Amino acid sequence: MIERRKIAVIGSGQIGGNIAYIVGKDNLADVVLFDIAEGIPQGKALDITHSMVMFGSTSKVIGTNDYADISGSDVVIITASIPGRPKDDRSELLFGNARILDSVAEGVKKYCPNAFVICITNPLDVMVSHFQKVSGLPHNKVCGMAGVLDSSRFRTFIAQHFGVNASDVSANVIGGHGDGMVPATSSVSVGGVPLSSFIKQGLITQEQIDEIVCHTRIAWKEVADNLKTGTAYFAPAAAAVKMAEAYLKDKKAVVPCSAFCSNHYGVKGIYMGVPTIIGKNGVEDILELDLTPLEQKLLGESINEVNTISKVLDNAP
Amino acid sequence: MIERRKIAVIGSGQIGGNIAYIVGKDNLADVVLFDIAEGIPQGKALDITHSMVMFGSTSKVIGTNDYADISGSDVVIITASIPGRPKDDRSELLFGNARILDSVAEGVKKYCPNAFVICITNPLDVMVSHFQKVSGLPHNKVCGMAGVLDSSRFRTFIAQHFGVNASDVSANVIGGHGDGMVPATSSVSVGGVPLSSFIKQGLITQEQIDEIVCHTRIAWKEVADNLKTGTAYFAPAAAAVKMAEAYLKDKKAVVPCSAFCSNHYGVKGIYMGVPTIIGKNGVEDILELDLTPLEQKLLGESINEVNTISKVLDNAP
Numbered sequence: 001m002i003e004r005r006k007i008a009v010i011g012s013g014q015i016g017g018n019i020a021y022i023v024g025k026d027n028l029a030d031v032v033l034f035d036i037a038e039g040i041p042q043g044k045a046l047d048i049t050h051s052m053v054m055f056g057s058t059s060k061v062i063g064t065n066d067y068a069d070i071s072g073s074d075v076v077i078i079t080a081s082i083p084g085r086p087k088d089d090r091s092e093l094l095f096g097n098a099r100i101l102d103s104v105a106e107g108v109k110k111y112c113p114n115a116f117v118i119c120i121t122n123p124l125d126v127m128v129s130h131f132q133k134v135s136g137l138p139h140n141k142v143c144g145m146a147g148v149l150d151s152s153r154f155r156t157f158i159a160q161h162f163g164v165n166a167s168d169v170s171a172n173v174i175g176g177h178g179d180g181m182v183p184a185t186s187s188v189s190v191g192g193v194p195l196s197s198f199i200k201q202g203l204i205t206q207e208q209i210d211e212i213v214c215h216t217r218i219a220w221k222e223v224a225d226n227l228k229t230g231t232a233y234f235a236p237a238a239a240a241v242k243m244a245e246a247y248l249k250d251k252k253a254v255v256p257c258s259a260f261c262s263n264h265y266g267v268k269g270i271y272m273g274v275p276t277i278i279g280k281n282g283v284e285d286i287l288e289l290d291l292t293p294l295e296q297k298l299l300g301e302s303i304n305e306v307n308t309i310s311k312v313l314d315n316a317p
Numbered sequence: 318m319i320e321r322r323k324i325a326v327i328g329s330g331q332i333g334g335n336i337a338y339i340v341g342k343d344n345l346a347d348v349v350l351f352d353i354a355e356g357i358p359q360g361k362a363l364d365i366t367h368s369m370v371m372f373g374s375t376s377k378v379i380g381t382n383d384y385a386d387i388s389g390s391d392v393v394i395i396t397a398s399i400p401g402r403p404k405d406d407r408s409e410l411l412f413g414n415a416r417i418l419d420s421v422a423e424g425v426k427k428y429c430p431n432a433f434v435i436c437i438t439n440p441l442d443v444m445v446s447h448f449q450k451v452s453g454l455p456h457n458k459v460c461g462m463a464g465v466l467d468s469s470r471f472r473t474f475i476a477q478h479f480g481v482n483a484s485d486v487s488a489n490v491i492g493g494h495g496d497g498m499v500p501a502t503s504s505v506s507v508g509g510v511p512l513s514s515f516i517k518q519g520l521i522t523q524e525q526i527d528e529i530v531c532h533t534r535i536a537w538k539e540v541a542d543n544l545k546t547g548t549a550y551f552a553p554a555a556a557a558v559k560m561a562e563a564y565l566k567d568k569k570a571v572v573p574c575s576a577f578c579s580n581h582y583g584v585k586g587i588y589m590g591v592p593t594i595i596g597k598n599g600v601e602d603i604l605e606l607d608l609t610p611l612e613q614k615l616l617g618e619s620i621n622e623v624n625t626i627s628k629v630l631d632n633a634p
């Protein structure tokens with residue numbers, strides 16, 4: 001008995017609304033846009049419902065403040081967060097967003113415990129870890145969106161240098177979504193050609209690569225300082241939809257994201273950004289990148305950042 | 318010589334950003350987001366650029382505040398407007414927006430006078446007329462977006478009543494984008510079946526049709542009262558992309574928009590909501606709907622309100 005796919009978006013602010021809009025435009029699923037703020041999800045859903053006939057989609061998009069409406073959701077995307085952009089570090093939202101997730105975790109557990117959950121709420125790696133702990137869902141059914149956005153940014157910057165289509169740049173960012181993220185230049189390729197080759201050829205300099213690595217690392221502040229009123233939300237929404245697609249269409253897509261890693265990268269059971277294979281059973285596998293010693297070390301420092309914020313959360317007021 | 322298609326969005330608020338996002342996602346053209354507000358267009362353009370590789374698009378999107386950047390634009394879409402949502406009417410903002418439009422007209426006149434210009438700035442029909450006058454562009458290359466958004470709502474509401482895909486509802490809303498808009502119920506068909514027939518089959522009462530007509534004219538308020546921030550912006554951005562598409566792909570598509578009508582509907586040269594044929598030469602034709610005496614009267618009232626407010630603006634100091 002064919003049933004329409006259903007995605008619940010918890011939090012209907014900037015990112016949440018664009019997720020709804022893109023999912024409906026692609027006719028990927030019906031969408032349930034959930035928020036505790038009166039009127040916001042309802043009006044965004046009505047406005048998006050009107051664009052449906054324009055896109056040729058028959059997806060249904062409704063607004064709600066009732067967890068009961070997310071029952072049967074195949075995928076839950078969590079964007080809910082306290083207000084205001086982080087001033088210097090995504091960690092500043094730690095205390096407030098962990099409380100919100102406790103609440104979202106109760107709604108999920110009761111209305112759609114078999115859903116694939118994708119967290120977006122910052123500080124990402126720690127929020128995903130917190131969510132999985134308080135909700136009790138299987139590790140492979142809970143992951144965080146970050147890698148796809150960090151890697152799209154790294155691929156884009158590399159592509160803008162060489163003047164080529166970014167889809168032809170292969171490049172991963174691993175580790176937690178924060179200042180210590182590791183854009184792995186060691187395995188970047190452009191049409192099959194490694195960066196070491198472009199250096200010999202004289203078409204890119206190590207300094208140029210270094211600037212790309214840095215740009216990647218603090219790209220969030222560049223966008224946030226220009227928007228003034230908030231942080232990025234167009235690409236983070238497209239990234240969440242790519243992850244939801246991988247699950248709903250059982251793609252076996254290789255997706256860098258925050259996933260529970262306990263056997264690769266020399267860690268034994270932590271959520272962090274790694275290349276995963278996503279399909280109908282959620283995170284189905286993690287791939288082992290070939291890191292240089294210097295990279296294995298920068299990863300090591302990333303992991304410590306994650307552990308530190310995490311201990312801080314464990315000792316919250 | 319193949320050149321990339323180029324679309325300038327004048328005004329990067331709620332609607333402009335969404336238009337950039339969609340156009341980019343569909344790889345329909347490169348996008349220039351123009352705003353005089355500091356940082357907004359650069360920030361949205363940068364965030365959207367990061368999402369191009371996720372959508373598999375090579376569209377380039379940049380933000381600027383220099384009209385010289387819109388030169389060579391094949392289409393210009395105008396969303397520039399002074400702050401604050403309409404209270405009861407999209408009219409109140411008349412002078413400020415006409416002032417704003419004067420700048421854009423000089424901008425377009427200098428940098429890309431061969432562009433197809435689509436206005437969205439309210440009060441729509443007057444704004445469009447004003448833009449064409451002061452810019453001097455061919456009448457058939459200047460029009461306003463309203464009908465697509467109104468007809469989409471009208472189709473959506475008819476489709477919800479019958480429980481069928483809105484894409485299979487054929488329906489037009491003509492006249493001014495105001496309370497004086499005319500949802501032409503006599504032009505309604507659902508898979509070939511007319512409302513009279515559904516009437517006789519007892520599948521819809523006249524009361525229900527009336528309520529649908531009313532829902533259409535006041536639908537914008539319903540969205541605005543829920544957003545508590547401004548007016549609808551997801552569906553109006555999509556409607557403008559559909560208009561840009563008919564132009565760029567030379568579709569010869571039926572697009573209900575605000576065009577220079579001068580030998581149909583009993584008017585001799587005014588800008589109003591009518592069913593046009595858009596292709597690579599802009600508005601290439603206007604179709605003549607089979608209106609009932611009542612609708613002819615209703616359109617009548619609508620037509621006066623345009624000229625009325627149009628004179629209020631022809632004077633001023």
Ligand SMILES: NC(=O)c1ccc[n+]([C@@H]2O[C@H](COP(=O)([O-])OP(=O)(O)OC[C@H]3O[C@@H](n4cnc5c(N)ncnc54)[C@H](O)[C@@H]3O)[C@@H](O)[C@H]2O)c1
Pocket residue numbers: 010011012013014015016034035036037040079080081082083084093097100103119120121122123124145146149177230231232233236
């Ligand atoms: N993972 C990443 O790559 C990434 C990238 C960009 C932004 N973000 C983060 O995603 C989050 C959302 O960003 P945004 O711009 O959409 O924020 P926003 O402020 O625009 O939206 C957050 C929404 O959460 C709603 N909300 C609040 N408390 C809630 C609750 N208890 N239950 C349900 N909804 C609730 C709000 O009412 C609001 O509409 C932030 O934490 C931001 O830092 C993450």
Ligand SMILES: NC(=O)c1ccc[n+]([C@@H]2O[C@H](COP(=O)([O-])OP(=O)(O)OC[C@H]3O[C@@H](n4cnc5c(N)ncnc54)[C@H](O)[C@@H]3O)[C@@H](O)[C@H]2O)c1
Pocket residue numbers: 327328329330331332333351352353354357396397398399400401403407417420436437438439440441462463466494547548549550553
């Ligand atoms: N035609 C319709 O169907 C329809 C439907 C919905 C909304 N609208 C109207 O569309 C317009 C835009 O709506 P919105 O929600 O995007 O508004 P918005 O306030 O979010 O954006 C308007 C943008 O105009 C910019 N701006 C101001 N002065 C400018 C100038 N001189 N040059 C360039 N940019 C300038 C602002 O800085 C802002 O970014 C309004 O007039 C709104 O009422 C029309």
